[PDB]
Structures are given as C-alpha cells and as structure tokens.
Amino acid sequence: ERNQRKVYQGRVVSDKMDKTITVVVETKKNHPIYGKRMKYSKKYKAHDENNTAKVGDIVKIMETRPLSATKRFRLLEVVEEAV
Amino acid sequence: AVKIRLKRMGSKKSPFYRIVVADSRSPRDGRFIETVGTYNPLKDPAEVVLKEDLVLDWLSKGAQPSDTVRNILSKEGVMKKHHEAKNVK
Amino acid sequence: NIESAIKRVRTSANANAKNSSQTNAMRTAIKKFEEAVAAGADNVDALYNEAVKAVDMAATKGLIHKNKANRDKIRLSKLAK
RNA sequence: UGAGAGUUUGAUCCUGGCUCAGGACGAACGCUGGCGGCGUGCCUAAUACAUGCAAGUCGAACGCUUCUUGGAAAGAGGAGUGGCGGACGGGUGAGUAACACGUGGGUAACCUACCCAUCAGAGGGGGAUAACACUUGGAAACAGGUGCUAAUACCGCAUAACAGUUUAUGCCGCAUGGCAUAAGAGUGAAAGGCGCUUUCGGGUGUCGCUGAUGGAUGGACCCGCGGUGCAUUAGCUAGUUGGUGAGGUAACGGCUCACCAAGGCCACGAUGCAUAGCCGACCUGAGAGGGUGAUCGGCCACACUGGGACUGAGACACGGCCCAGACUCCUACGGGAGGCAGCAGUAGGGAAUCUUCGGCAAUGGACGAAAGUCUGACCGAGCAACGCCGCGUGAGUGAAG
RNA sequence: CAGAAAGCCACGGCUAACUACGUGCCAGCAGCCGCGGUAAUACGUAGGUGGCAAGCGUUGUCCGGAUUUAUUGGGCGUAAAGCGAGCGCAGGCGGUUUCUUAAGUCUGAUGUGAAAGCCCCCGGCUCAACCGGGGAGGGUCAUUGGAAACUGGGAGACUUG
C-alpha cells in the first residue's frame, strides 16, 4: 500500500440503474493549434450500494477493480445535495 | 538467466568491440539492461577499457560472465576478485 | 518438414494417452464423491478423503500447477467437510 | 540565422494567377576507367519455388549392437529408451482506427524450471515395454502378432501443511480488505549418478530430487492523456446495461449459464465507408510547422487460405500435429508426398535492384564431469561508380608569339 | 619511368559566353516571355567562350521561394468576399466592489522521457569521415510545497448598463 486512486469530484447525472449511478467530471484544456480553453467531459459509471445520491448530487469517486462490463468506480462521500 | 557478454562495432577490416551486459533472452547487439566496458581488437597490447564497478554488483544478482570476460577480467583479476571476495565474501 | 521432433510427437502421444486416463480417473473420482453428498446416506468420509487424495495426487503425482487443486479443496471443504 | 526575378496595358498604380533561380532519386547514365576509407542495394506480385545449407545435445539416467586388436578390454561406431532445447536466433508489413503504439500509472483481482537465498527433507517394491529374435500384411509410407529385459522411464504405500481455509487474539487501511501469533480437516521424492577412504566399514565432497517462503528475469490484466479523411456517413446496441447466484478462469469480469428489470453510447461526432503497421528518428524551414516511416534499434501482427487442439510451466507453435479448401509430384491406382514473407540461387512482373566462398579463429546461442558437435546468427571474403569521406592525372623555369 | 591516370551541357532576356554560311511562313527550338519568314548570339552546322568538376545532363517525387489557408502572418464600399430581414434554444463573451477558494495561471523539490541519433566539450584512426568519454534537447508527464494579481467557484453590496 502506497497509492490510492485519483479521485474525480464529478456530479451525479443518471441513477436509474440498480446499485449504479452516473458521475460526470468536467475539465477544460487548450487547443493543439490555437489558444483558448475548450470545455469537455467524459462519463464515469459508478457503483453504489443502494443508489444514495440523487440527480445533481456532488460526490467524489474512487476506482477499485473491473466489476462489470467495464465499470470501475465507487462512491466515497455525498458532498452536497440538490433540492 | 541474466548474462554479460560482448558486442561488435566493426567496419570492413578493422573492428571495434564492446562488452555489453544484458539478459540472455535478448539478441547480442539488441536490447540490454545497462552498460559495462569495451576493449580494442587492434594494436596489442590493446586498450583494456573496463568499468570494473558493475561486474561484482551484477554477479551479486547472479549471472554468468562468458569465456572472453573471464580471461580478460582475470587479466584485471576480477574473476580472481570474484572468487576472492565472494567465496571469501 | 520434420527433422528430429517426431520423437517429441510420439512422446506427446503417450502423454495424451496416460494424461487422458489420469484426468478421467480424477473426474470420475470427483463425481463419485459428489453423488454421495447430495444423497445423504452412508459412505460420506471414505470417498471424501478419496476425492481429496485424487485431487492432490493428480496435482503433484499428476499436474495442473497447484491451484485448481487448491480451489477444488476450498470449494469442497466449504461444501462437505 | 528571413535577399527576389520575369509575364495582363500605348504607357501608370494596385489586386492577382503561372514559371524560375535553392536544396532530400534508399535503386534507369547512352561517357569513362584511380576509388583499393565508410555505408547501401525487389518499394511492382503477402507471385510460384528446382539445388544445397539453415537445431541438435547428453555413455557420471539407462539397457542392446558394428570394428583395430576363443578367453582381452581401451578407443571407436549403430540403434533405442530417457533428459533438455526446437516458443531463442533470422524473414515480411498482408491485416489492425484498437489500450495495437507513445507516455504517465495501478497489482488490498496476477502468474514463471531456466541464477542465487532459507528451512524441511530426501524408503521399500511392482508390472510392462522399446530395443532385441521370428513370422503375418505390406508397391511403398508404415502397420500387426508372440516371447524376454533396464533405468534419474512408468506405476500404488508411510511420513510434514509451514500452503489453504475457519476460529480467537492484537494492529491498520481507499469499499472490498490487509498484517503477526495460537489451533480444528488431506496431502511428495530420483530411495539417483560420479570419486575417495574402501580392514566388517559406510562416512562421504559434488552433481542431481521434492515441499514451503524470498530477491531478481520474463509474461498478463486495467486506467488518464496523444497522433486521419469523409456529416453529398445521425442514430447505434440486446449478452447489450445493471443486479442476483452458480460454473469457469494464473488472475477480475456477462468470459459463460439461470432469474429480475430496461438500461447503455451519441452533435465534444456514436455507428458506418475509405486508406495506413506504430515509434526512436531523418542530407527540408528563419521559426512556427509541413513531408516521408529504409537503414539501425524497440513494440505489434503474419507463415499457400480457414478452423481446432495436444506435449510442454511458457505455443494455439515459421522448417510440430489433426480436419476442411486451393495448387503441385509419385502410386503396383488401394493410397501416399509438399509449403524459402530463414541464406544464396531460380521463373514472371517491372523505369528499375547482387555471390549458390570459408569458419566458428572473433563474438552469441544449445546441451554436458570434458574434449567437444551444430549455426546461411555472426565474423569476414567475391559484385553494382549506388552514394559520402580523403587524396590523385607532375612541379620550378622556359616565345616578338 | 613524367611515363598508366580526362571526361560533361548552353551561350535573345531572366542567367557570365561571338563569328562565317545554309534551310530562308518553311524545315524545328522553346522552363516562361517568346523565335522564325535571305541578312537569326533563338532553325543547323563549324570553330571561339562559360560553370561545375570522374563524375557531370535528363526524368519523377518532397519541402521552400508562397503572407498562395495568414496562431505567429491576409480581409469583405466599388476587385473574389456581409446571408433579404427579424425572433430566439444551446453555445461564445460579460458593469463596480468586500471576504473566501485555488480549477486555470506563476514558482521550488523529486522519479522518468532506452542506447546509438543532431549539436556542443574532450580524444583516436597519417587528417577526414567512423569510433570513444560527459551533459544540454525530447512532459502539453506523475507526486509533493507555496504564491492569491488576472480568469473561474461561494457569500454580501451599489446604480451608471
């Protein structure tokens, strides 16, 4: 033990699946020719115990091991809740 | 199965040779792990250009120096120093 | 074509024959054990340790490497004794 | 380290296209002879292959047989069992838009004889067989029957769980979980080989064998990011998406089965179509950036085409096998034989691209108590002015031409 | 023994190199402008000269010259170029100010970016290429620590838009 996983504090988008939500991180980087800052994202399939976080919730996530057809994320901390 | 060995750098008539240290799965002048020494193939008494720092470090891991390495490093006594500082250790 | 590995071919053929016999012996030993456990009657310990002997002697006297023998003894002792 | 020159009109200034002066033909000189230093040489058909060479080694694991010398045994030789290697080394870029590559990372979901470290150890037997002698079927390839025999070949029994759970104990971590001690159920061997002391001795040094933990070497899995044209290519998907449990796997996992739901991916380009092996690198540019992927080196993939496994830890195997297909040589016509994109060498294609020389002396493999044996790797040799070095084909003097 | 050791394409301009004659709307030269056509440094001979140099012409392909895809580095009144005009989803950019934050940003330390590569320092092959020793280059990289001006996230304020 000397290394954890790179936690990605994304927000929750979908939670329709059992034990499984959808966490979307967001970052912004340059253009390979011009200069200004773009905006882009991926989607991270996250495994929950009983689908705690609602739509729009903020949670940091941490990878464990291939659990399914390549979902590789776990819940850590429900940071702040939508209402 | 690590193994220290030699390596050629010839031209047409006049070669130049180099010792090289590797693992025995690899080809000879192909890949390796690190570097040890060289020697002149011409102008006897030629240029014994040796590192003499990684041979005993490398055989502490345990390897098999080849036929030429044993003779030309018994000229520097490294194999003599091998069984002198390892069989006495 | 062939130079000198036809002896390797015949060696592999004999290994096919005897390894087929030994693996079929192991499998029938394991199923002979597994019939009795769902049955529930007598002869539950003799064939138990015979199945464990069969797995271990086909592991070492035979070969898998170590661990299908180990996974079988785990799933066996976690099921029977 | 950044040079502009022509050309539209009767002449002018602008804007603008075309052409030229530089270097980057991996291979066409019709000339000619110095190249004797350093390097390169099928890019089109991943087209078809005569000829030879390109993988064997161990007699200190073990039986049998052909010779220099009817009893003699050293050296030699022949076959077989058995052991390790034929998965390294060499060739090609047909496929591949993907964790194939480059870079940064993860192993509390991973495996390994081949080199050392540590501890436990390390018996008695059986019963066949090859070889061997004779016969049957054989055109042959190769099958078959009887009898006898060895081992470090094969085959059952004793001993330890330290592995592996499960329990208690303490300690900690990012969810699983991990780390030390104590205890509940089963498990091997080549017991072998050489040499010495050999006074019964039987102690041995070494080389081997097995089990459990380590380092190192090799392989595998996953993850963030980066490199292509078409939107006159906008929807795609059902083992798909998730959960349940089981099988299976070195290893996690819909990898696979049965049940419950309908989830997943997309305008930041999903899916579709075409082309391409990727990289370190380069005789271009002032520089930002454009062009090529040969050497030489690294990774990936392929072996006339497509499937499939077996031995072996390591292969779904380039000179290993089985089946289907195409193509080629024999057959005594019932049946058999083969895959140079290994090295030269061959015929076709093309604007176009070489020698059928020796040796492991050098080095590097492979086995071994040893000399040793093999190597078209490699060392080097014999061709093409094919490109770059560095030098040559006289010098000092000497005319009213 | 100076003995064996010399070959290439043009000369109207761009771009150093002239004569004599012939065919004289024709035989044929063109990289482009452009020649010819009885007085051709342009068609063809022959001599004169020129520039590389045992290597020199032609052909094909790649970058430049090209600011002729312009981020560095171009502009749309008449030259090629503002949709016929409005309304608005997503998207791009946003008035002043207090406190916080630290994603972007600046900065240190550490591991890595194979070796031969190019360059530079040093050296040997008679120099030279070729070979050898040492570091800079290739991260838009990973961990870790600060900086809090500007952009970005959170709480309040103001009246000019």
CA-nearest of C52, C48, C45 to C72 is: C52
Rg (C-alpha) for chain B, rounded Å, is 13
Torsion angle of the four alpha carbons B71, B75, B79, B82, in this order, in degrees rounded to the nearest 10: -170
User: By what method was this entry solved?
Assistant: cryo-EM
- The resolution, in Å, is 3.5
CA-nearest of B63, B46, B12, B30 to B38 is: B46
The kind and range of the H/E element at B10 are none
**Which residue bears the tokens 């390897």?**
B63
- Confirm if B4 and B55 have CB atoms less than 8 A apart: yes
Q: What is the number of structural domains in chain A? A: 1
In chain B, count H helices and then E strands.
3, 4
3-class DSSP assignment, residue B8: strand
With CA of C66 and C1' of each nucleotide, the nearest comes out as: D163
DSSP character at residue A55:
T
Rounded alpha-carbon distances, angstroms, from residue B29 to A49, A69, B12, B39, B57 = 56, 44, 18, 15, 22
CA-nearest of A47, A44, A56 to A75 is: A47
Range of the domain at A27: 1-83
Copy the structure tokens of residue A23. 């966490």
Give the C-alpha separation, B9 to B14, whole Å. Answer: 9
The kind and range of the H/E element at A8 are none
CA-nearest of B42, B36, B38, B77 to B57 is: B36
Q: Which amino acid is at C7?
A: K
With CA of A30 and C1' of each nucleotide, the nearest comes out as: E140
Sketch the domain layout of chain B as residue ranges.
Answer: 1-89
Give the C-alpha separation, C67 to C34, whole Å. Answer: 20
With CA of B16 and C1' of each nucleotide, the nearest comes out as: E131
Which residue numbers come right before each break in chain B (C to N over 2.5 Å)?
Answer: none
- Confirm if A58 and A7 have CB atoms less than 8 A apart: no
- Confirm if B19 and B4 have CB atoms less than 8 A apart: yes
In strand D, which positions have an atom below 7 A from any protein CB? 37-39, 55-56, 81-83, 85-86, 88-90, 105-109, 111-112, 114-116, 154-157, 161, 163-165, 173-176, 185-189, 210-212, 215-218, 221-227, 240-244, 247-255, 262-266, 268, 297-299, 310-313, 317, 319-321, 337-339, 362-366, 377-381
Report the nearest residue to nucleotide D108, CA vs C1': A1
Through-space separation of residue B65 CA and nucleotide E55 C1' in angstroms: 52
**DSSP bridge pairs for B39:** B17, B48
Give the C-alpha separation, C18 to B85, whole Å. Answer: 51
Distant-in-sequence, close-in-space partners of C64: CB < 8 Å, separation ≥ 6: C58
CA-nearest of B33, B26, B31, B25 to B61 is: B33
- B59 Cα distance to chain centroid: 12
- C77 Cα distance to chain centroid: 16
